[PDB]
Amino acid sequence: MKKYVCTVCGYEYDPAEGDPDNGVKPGTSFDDLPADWVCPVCGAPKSEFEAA
Template identity: 45%
Template sequence: MSKFKCPECAYVFSEADGDEHEGYPPGTEFASLPEDFACPDCSVRFKEDFEKV
């Protein structure tokens, strides 16, 4: 289980925790997120921009 960080606003997607509010349950793999996934906090960085923590 890894964590991925938005390089713009530091939002972190944790695979272990998921993001309940966004509808991604704990255990959601980052790779399984939709291809057009945008950062839930800033919306100006996308899945391919996220950096593994």
């Protein structure tokens, strides 16, 4: 229940799912994501992500 969103394009991330774009398992936390990880939609850095 931490579904965040991008502050550039708007790509609701799923922590309970992960992220194949880069390679993440379900039940993971964004913060857990790598630094080289970025909104795989626009580009914005993970630093531009917040929990709405």
